[PDB]
């Protein structure tokens, strides 16, 4: 009954009280409505879609999830890295998941409006592709509401700041529950 989250800075509350950080408010709603789940959090800062990979099957094998919740690929785009190796590698770890017995929901995240929409794009549509693939659940705008707004983004436009947090878990809630 384990709910894994695989992400990077975004997930791991980076420049922030992590206890008031999406996955933390992720595990009280969880707690709140009554649902009957650990909330086991494995976000870094710096993971790409390689990283993520390349950890998973330990924390498959470790925690042996229900649910594991991908957030990764924001730091491959933002590298200006291969969009076909970030849906090789999301592919290959939504692949390893689901063969552990988790149910698997990929968060999509679309980079700031001056890397111009082919570029935005380019990312963007790996994570419907993905999920098209392996069968996943898809939250393809993670980032609703706080990409690119005033208050919700920390100053360098990337990392959300603490007034994001209930948005972002208001973006997964709606598409995780039913998986619940």
């Given at each position: 009954?384990?709910?894994?989250?695989?992400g990077?800075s975004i997930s791991a509350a980076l420049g922030l009280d992590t206890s008031q950080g999406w996955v933390a408010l992720?595990?009280?709603?969880?707690?709140?409505?009554?649902?009957?789940?650990?909330?086991?959090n494995?976000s870094?800062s710096?993971?790409?879609?390689?990283?993520?990979?390349?950890?998973?099957?330990?924390?498959?094998?470790?925690?042996?999830?229900?649910?594991?919740?991908?957030?990764?690929?924001?730091?491959?785009?933002?590298?200006?890295?291969?969009?076909?190796?970030?849906?090789?590698?999301?592919?290959?770890?939504?692949?390893?998941?689901?063969?552990?017995?988790?149910?698997?929901?990929?968060?999509?995240?679309?980079?700031?409006?001056?890397?111009?929409?082919?570029?935005?794009?380019?990312?963007?549509?790996?994570?419907?592709?993905?999920?098209?693939?392996?069968?996943?659940?898809?939250?393809?705008?993670?980032?609703?509401?706080?990409?690119?707004?005033?208050?919700?983004?920390?100053?360098?436009?990337?990392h959300p700041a603490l007034?994001a947090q209930?948005?972002l878990?208001?973006?997964?809630?709606?598409?995780?529950?039913?998986?619940?």
């Amino acid at each position: 009954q384990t709910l894994l989250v695989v992400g990077d800075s975004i997930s791991a509350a980076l420049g922030l009280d992590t206890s008031q950080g999406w996955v933390a408010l992720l595990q009280k709603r969880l707690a709140d409505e009554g649902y009957d789940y650990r909330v086991v959090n494995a976000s870094i800062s710096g993971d790409t879609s390689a990283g993520g990979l390349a950890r998973l099957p330990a924390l498959l094998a470790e925690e042996k999830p229900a649910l594991v919740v991908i957030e990764l690929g924001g730091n491959d785009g933002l590298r200006g890295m291969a969009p076909a190796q970030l849906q090789q590698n999301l592919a290959s770890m939504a692949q390893k998941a689901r063969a552990e017995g988790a149910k698997v929901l990929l968060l999509g995240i679309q980079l700031p409006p001056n890397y111009g929409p082919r570029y935005i794009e380019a990312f963007s549509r790996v994570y419907g592709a993905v999920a098209a693939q392996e069968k996943t659940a898809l939250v393809p705008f993670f980032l609703e509401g706080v990409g690119g707004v005033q208050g919700m983004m920390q100053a360098d436009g990337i990392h959300p700041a603490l007034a994001a947090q209930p948005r972002l878990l208001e973006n997964v809630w709606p598409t995780l529950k039913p998986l619940l």
